[PDB]
Amino acid sequence: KIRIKLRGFDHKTLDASAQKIVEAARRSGAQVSGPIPLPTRVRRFTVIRGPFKHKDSREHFELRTHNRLVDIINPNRKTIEQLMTLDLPTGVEIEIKT
């Protein structure tokens, strides 16, 4: 039974990733275990917009982590290659565990 985490930035990177891995490993594992999201985590930051003295020019934005925890049951060999070398996105990374 395999656990996985694709923690990503773009809200299309996690999509290409979990998509290719859950649908392609749908001819191998236990057909996968649905890309369970996770409450996409948010980190906010604000800063003065008007350089130097201006306790009012600022504003803000943020950086965060969207999380997709795909997962596939029945370690049925074949699965390892319907995702492990048949991937396609770019704005995340292949986190695999068990």
Partner: protein, 60 residues
Amino acid sequence: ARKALIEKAKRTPKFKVRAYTRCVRCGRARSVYRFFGLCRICLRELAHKGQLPGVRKASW
């Protein structure tokens, strides 16, 4: 252009007590957090451009 003080990295804490924070871009050791290590400005401005990974403007 405060060249003479670009010593911030030779660390020589020589008593942790001295090595000090800083903004990698526009120097300014004033407000220089971490994950960014920038002056609120060098910072926020280059971010503005956006060649500063994922991070995106706020709304709500």
